[PDB]
Design a binder for this molecule. Structure first.
Ligand SMILES: *[C@@H]1O[C@H](CO)[C@@H](O)[C@H](O)[C@H]1NC(C)=O
Ligand SMILES: *[C@@H]1O[C@H](CO)[C@@H](O)[C@H](O)[C@H]1NC(C)=O
Lengths: 304, 268
């Protein structure tokens, strides 16, 4: 699964020619696109998108958006486009141009040991730099109109105090239904275990088995201020009826979740090697007792 | 094969009127990085393994004395899997043979089938699993971040070097190993560190950085990514097309980055 990005922070887009700057992106299911706009206008992506507005969960069901990143659903039915406009106001251009220069960050011989050090140390901070940016972006709320950057980038307080950008995505269709539970009442049957379909679902618990390398997950019934137990699922799960860090059971895992609510699905990519059998679970939690279910996962040992 | 099945091969069933205990032996001589496996017992076969924590615990001799812990008896061992089929007992175990520079030596794990007959006595169809750890002659071209006197890798680091008491945690530790074709490479990181990427030897970091090139350029074999032991191993291919450079990072919060980087020179 490839990962796309449209960074309107670049001088290649800020000092462009025409008045309508456009980056184009063609993605596939389970891909992830990231969008960095200085001052989001019209809709608020990736939670609400522009059709020429709609919320991404209705357009591409099964998607998750965290920070400024859209993990596309592991099952799309029809090829669908989206659009997100970004208003480059004259001084927003100027302001970030002043921050992008302060940052200042193909066939290299690198014979000397020391110059090989510099190219690698240079590559190491771009690694360390991007990590702290998605961490800060995840802490961001869901409704955020004005992009801000993490402190300890050392950017000066004076810099913190025309063109129209349009990024357009098309993503293909597939046919491989999600190995998961859908705890919402709907007839779209995007998951292996809905409760619209009887039997997949018993005693408010959904019992799934996962093999090494598989991607599984669940999606709670929709509501604006719902919660998941534990709050940090999948990074912290219920194991032997106590809250355990998943990294102690299946290190090497990945996750695709929203830390601020239960609105979006929860996805766990089981690592390439799990050593024992492990039963874990997470629970949907709500002021509506009819919307509270347990997601029980049987993780089976093996390799891949 | 490389498996010592005691259910469907090397069968440990009793023959009728059995009155004495026999002992089948299953000797294996694997190469470094290969996977050995013990199948013993099932939902239809009440066999128990000794020690029940094998391979994490093994015996140093066929006579079930001098029980030892493999993490310390056979440094470098990885990929310990345990799979169960009857409840309350596990029946299929496996691990990956590590690099060894010392002389060969065996490790043992037994599997017994027990039954009382009618004075009275108890008769056992024991099955001994004898694995020989191969000896190599050159240490692995790699980095041990857990000891400055590594018995596996060529380069090593004392903890006074990978901690931030003497240097600040901003200056990371870059361990470059150069290696050529059919060479063993790897690294080991301390316990509470995490390896990035998740599949380092299938996906590393390009020297442009923050790039998982997924290694279409260098197709590695015998890839071992044990995130439970932060022990990583692989071997470069038969032929190196071009010279390549890639790296991976062990990280822990408020500590230096420990980075493993390889330059593969063109070889044949
Ligand atoms: C986002 O919405 C919440 C209510 O759900 C509100 O309290 C908060 O102030 C909003 N944030 C912004 C930046 O509008
Ligand atoms: C690793 O972390 C766990 C949990 O905090 C702790 O119990 C253990 O002692 C740590 N081990 C080392 C070697 O630091």
């Amino acid at each position: 699964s490839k990962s796309h990005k449209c960074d309107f922070t670049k001088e290649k887009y800020l000092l462009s020619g025409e008045k309508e700057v456009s980056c184009e992106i063609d993605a596939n299911p389970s891909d992830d696109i990231t969008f960095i706009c200085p001052n989001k206008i019209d809709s608020l992506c990736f939670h609400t998108v522009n059709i020429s507005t709609m919320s991404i969960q209705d357009l591409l069901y099964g998607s998750v958006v965290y920070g400024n990143t859209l993990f596309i659903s592991p099952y799309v039915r029809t090829n669908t486009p989206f659009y997100c406009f970004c208003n480059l106001d004259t001084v927003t251009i100027q302001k970030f141009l002043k921050i992008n220069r302060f940052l200042k960050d193909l066939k290299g011989g690198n014979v000397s040991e020391a110059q090989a050090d510099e190219y690698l140390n240079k590559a190491l901070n771009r690694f360390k730099k991007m990590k702290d940016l998605s961490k800060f972006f995840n802490d961001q709320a869901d409704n955020t109109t004005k992009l801000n950057l993490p402190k300890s980038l050392n950017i000066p307080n004076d810099i913190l105090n025309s063109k129209r950008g349009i990024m357009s995505v098309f993503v293909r269709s597939n046919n491989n239904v999600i190995k998961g539970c859908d705890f919402g009442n709907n007839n779209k049957n995007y998951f292996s275990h809905p409760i619209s379909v009887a039997g997949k679902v018993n005693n408010k618990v959904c019992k799934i088995q996962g093999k090494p390398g598989e991607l599984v997950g669940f999606k709670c019934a929709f509501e604006e201020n719902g919660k998941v137990e534990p709050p940090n699922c999948f990074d912290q799960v219920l194991h032997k009826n106590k809250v355990t860090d998943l990294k102690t059971l299946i290190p090497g895992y990945a996750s695709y979740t929203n830390k601020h609510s239960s609105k979006y699905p929860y996805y766990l990519k089981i690592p390439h090697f799990v050593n024992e059998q492990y039963t874990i679970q997470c629970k949907c939690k709500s002021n509506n007792s009819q919307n509270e279910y347990t997601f029980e996962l049987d993780i089976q040992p093996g390799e891949s | 094969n490389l498996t010592c099945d005691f259910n469907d091969v090397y069968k440990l069933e009793f023959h009728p009127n059995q009155q004495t205990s026999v002992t089948k032996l299953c000797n294996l001589t694997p190469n470094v990085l290969e996977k050995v496996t013990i199948k013993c017992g099932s939902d239809k076969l009440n066999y128990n393994l000794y020690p029940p924590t094998c391979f994490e615990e093994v015996y140093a001799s066929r006579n079930m004395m001098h029980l030892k812990k493999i993490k310390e008896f056979v440094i470098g061992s990885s990929m310990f899997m345990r799979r169960s089929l009857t409840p309350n007992k596990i029946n299929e175990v496996s691990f990956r043979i590590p690099p060894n520079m010392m002389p060969e030596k065996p490790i043992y794990c037994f599997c017994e089938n027990k039954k009382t007959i009618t004075s009275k006595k108890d008769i056992i169809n024991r099955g001994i699993v004898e694995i020989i750890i191969p000896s190599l002659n050159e240490k692995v071209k790699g980095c041990d971040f857990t000891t400055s006197e590594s018995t596996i890798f060529s380069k090593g680091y004392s903890i006074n070097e990978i901690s931030n008491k003497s240097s600040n945690n901003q200056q990371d530790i870059v361990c470059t190993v150069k290696a050529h074709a059919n060479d063993l490479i790897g690294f080991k990181c301390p316990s509470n560190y995490s390896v990035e990427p998740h599949d380092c030897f299938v996906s590393a970091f390009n020297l442009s950085g923050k790039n998982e090139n997924l290694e279409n350029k260098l197709k590695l074999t015998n890839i071992i990514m044990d995130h439970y032991n932060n022990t990583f191993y692989s071997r470069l291919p038969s032929l190196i097309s071009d010279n390549w450079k890639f790296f991976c990072v062990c990280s822990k919060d408020n500590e230096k980055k420990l980075v493993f980087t390889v330059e593969a020179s063109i070889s044949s």
